[PDB]
């Protein structure tokens, strides 16, 4: 392979605003795969965004930017050391009282 560290700890930062979405329910761990190749291709919110786009083009191009945002800012925290399994905590927790209902008392 050739950058697939970068793409582990990446895909885990790109799902945290993925899976952060309120209207990304479905097709959230794969579409972060495809954030991450195009990272690693180059790192163009301009062409990413636009492919991104061109597959996902149903819902508001931002919340699409937002989560190549991310991918971005990742890229620099991974290259100088960050941890991506920490942030999955977070969504977890989040991801849980999406769907936590009826646990109360």
């Keep these: 392979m ?58 508001s191009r931002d919340t699409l930017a937002n989560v190549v945002q991310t991918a971005f800012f990742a890229l620099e925290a991974l290259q100088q050391g960050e941890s991506a399994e920490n942030i999955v905590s977070k969504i977890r927790m989040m991801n849980a009282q999406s769907l936590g209902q009826s646990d109360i008392a």
Excluded: R
């Design 2 to 59: 050739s950058q697939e560290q970068y793409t582990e700890n990446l895909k885990v930062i790109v799902a945290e605003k993925l899976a952060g979405i309120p209207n990304f329910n479905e097709d959230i761990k794969y579409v972060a795969e495809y954030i991450v190749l195009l990272i690693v291709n180059g790192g163009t919110v301009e062409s990413v965004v636009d492919e991104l786009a061109s597959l996902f083009d149903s819902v």
